[PDB]
Design a protein around this ligand. Structure first.
Ligand SMILES: [Zn+2]
Ligand SMILES: [Zn+2]
Lengths: 92, 285, 52, 58, 283
């Protein structure tokens, strides 16, 4: 979520990196909007999205998924999502 | 036999790995006197022919060159061939190999060649040892080739007529232009190089003229040959095994829509290059 | 098919001789001769595990 | 060891989502065997592919 | 499948059979709908492609013609395309077959000629076979392309996303301008053909303009396309396929080994590609 808060879960899955399908995809890929390189090396990126014209969120992805030149710094983002990502990376 | 001037180039050192790459050019023979690899390394140009057409089988095609200067290059970077006043600034002599520096100096025919290099080696073991023989012998051979290329006097190879001209009318028609002065100052070797490279936009046949381009490709500067045009923007420059991880996904086992690329490749595809036109030629009986 | 081998000219190798010898010394103690019989027997049993 | 072992071997096959790493491993094994029989570098028919028999019925 | 509008040629009667048919390119898809055979047959040009790398293997790519006209020709001899005013006298349609004539009259919207032709067909057995529906199917194809083109294409590009100027950059080239205004007069089909056959002098990509050539080879014309330089003598045409003169004052050299020495080196093709106009694209 961009800003909203979850409710009503009764059970959780532990994150594991193997969940993150590295889609080998196809040589030509192009994407638009602000993009944030989570890792140059692992081809990991975050992208703005909005469901139902009203649900701001960011989409993680891992794959070719090339983009416009307009690469943006993660430094700029909100502390809330930043801390969330900081845990979820689990560089541990 | 070898004929590239730069194929001579070897020097005393602990080095056992001299890298002279000189192309088949050296055993070809058409008055370039230097291999394309040196034309690349120092002059960012490629050798060519204009297919001069003839209705007769005797097409009598002609020599040409085209430059490789990038569109981003500026000023000195766009200078193709400096003048004596500029080459020493343009090229890092000290990084360049000693003998190569000397060769450049002598091609400019500057006294500074002997003023500096011929004295400064005194301390060197190479100056003391037999390799001084090799050094000054290569010097002698180079001077020989230079004098061969020298046109200036009747007691020599060259004789009789010359008719090429340059400095053709500026659009804004600023009077004249020393470019001929530069031409004369430049060693006849360099003049022959210019003759090899530079097409005229017009050929005045004896009693007839033909024209081949709208507008000039090149301009000349007292500081050196300029990769530039008088007007508008610079033209677009035509751009230039172990195991690996990047092994492809499976995809459609199909060729799919190649109509466009196939028909385009069936059409002829443009030779996107930069022929050097600058000047004017005449003929008479 | 499930992938595309680019399948052109490729061979991997590495050259850190000192590294490799360090590895060797790390490997040295193990009575591989004795041990690998277990893996051989594993493959054998697998021969029947293959099917029921 | 060169092949970007961010994971132990066991993990690789215990996963099924990937095929890429598995294919690469198989290929390199074949290469090693071939070379050990032929003390001479080889690259052969430059079109080869793999499929995983992911089910007992196969 | 075949699409050259001249490949769509049909005969109402048993005599003629057009037995020099369309080039294979008629089955291709450039959206020109003309075989290059016909392109030579009627206009004296040959089509070509330019690849342009986007700093990658990926490219935008463009199609361009060369003209096929000599240095000595003048006036009508230099005309490549007419005005609606003068296609008649340019072509001598009467010498052309009635199907050709009527097709031209379609292009030029000549209702009067259409009416005359239909009024002649009224009594013909080709009309008894209602073969006119061949013409009407040609029309259906054309009109569908026009509803995809004439209000579309440039007219749909009235939107900022794109503009071409065909006017000469050099205002001193007085012959430009007014012709770039006249451009509006011609059928959008013709406009599409010309524009997708003539290189711009510049492209505005808001990234960076590029200048493809020093100076335009061609110029807009008061009636229709003419093979002419903006100024000066015409550049040497690479001419290729009575007691008259054939004089060519060759150079004297008998040397031939130089040719074998030089074959290894760039042999610049001599064609006359068509450059003119300022092109613009958003983004
Ligand atoms: Zn050489
Ligand atoms: Zn046709």
């Amino acid at each position: 979520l961009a800003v909203n808060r979850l409710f009503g879960a009764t059970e959780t899955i532990d994150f594991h990196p193997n969940l993150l399908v590295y889609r080998q995809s196809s040589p030509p890929v192009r994407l638009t909007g602000d993009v944030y390189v989570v890792d140059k090396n692992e081809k990991v990126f975050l992208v703005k999205h909005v469901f139902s014209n009203t649900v701001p969120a960011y989409l993680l992805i891992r794959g070719d998924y090339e983009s416009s030149s307009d690469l943006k710094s993660l430094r700029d983002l909100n502390p809330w999502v930043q801390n969330t990502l900081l845990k979820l990376l689990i560089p541990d | 036999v070898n004929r590239c001037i730069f194929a001579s180039i070897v020097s005393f050192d602990a080095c056992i790995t001299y890298k002279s790459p000189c192309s088949p050019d050296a055993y070809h023979d058409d008055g370039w006197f230097i291999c394309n690899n040196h034309l690349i390394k120092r002059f960012k140009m490629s050798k060519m022919v204009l297919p001069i057409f003839d209705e007769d089988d005797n097409q009598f095609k002609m020599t040409i060159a085209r430059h490789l200067v990038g569109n981003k290059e500026r000023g000195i970077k766009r200078i193709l061939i400096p003048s004596a006043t500029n080459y020493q600034d343009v090229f890092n002599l000290n990084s360049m190999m000693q003998a190569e520096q000397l060769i450049f100096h002598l091609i400019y025919n500057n006294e500074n060649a002997v003023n500096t290099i011929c004295d400064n080696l005194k301390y060197t073991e190479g100056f003391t040892s037999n390799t001084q023989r090799v050094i000054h012998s290569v010097y002698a051979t180079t001077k020989s080739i230079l004098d061969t290329t020298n046109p200036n006097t009747f007691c020599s190879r060259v004789s009789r007529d010359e008719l090429r001209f340059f400095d053709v009318t500026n659009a804004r028609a600023l009077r004249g232009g020393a470019g001929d002065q530069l031409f004369n100052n430049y060693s006849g070797f360099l003049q022959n190089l210019i003759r090899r490279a530079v097409a005229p936009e017009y050929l005045q046949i004896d009693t007839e003229e033909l024209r081949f381009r709208n507008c000039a490709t090149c301009i000349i500067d007292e500081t050196g040959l300029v990769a530039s045009v008088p007007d508008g923007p610079e033209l677009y420059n035509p751009i230039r095994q172990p195991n690996r991880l990047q092994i492809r996904n499976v995809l459609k086992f199909e060729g799919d829509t190649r109509e466009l690329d196939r028909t385009l490749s069936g059409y002829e595809e443009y030779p996107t290059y930069v022929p050097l036109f600058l000047g004017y030629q005449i003929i008479n009986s | 098919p499930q992938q595309y081998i680019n399948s052109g000219t490729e061979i991997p190798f590495c050259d850190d001789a000192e590294f490799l010898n360090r590895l060797l010394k790390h490997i040295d103690p193990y009575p591989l001769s004795r041990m690998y019989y277990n893996a051989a027997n594993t493959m054998f049993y697998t021969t029947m595990e293959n099917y029921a | 060891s060169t092949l970007e072992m961010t994971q132990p071997l066991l993990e690789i096959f215990r996963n099924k989502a990937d095929t890429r790493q598995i294919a690469a491993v198989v290929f390199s094994t074949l290469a090693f065997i071939h070379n050990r029989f032929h003390p001479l570098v080889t690259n052969f028919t430059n079109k080869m592919e793999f499929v995983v028999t992911e089910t007992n019925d196969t």
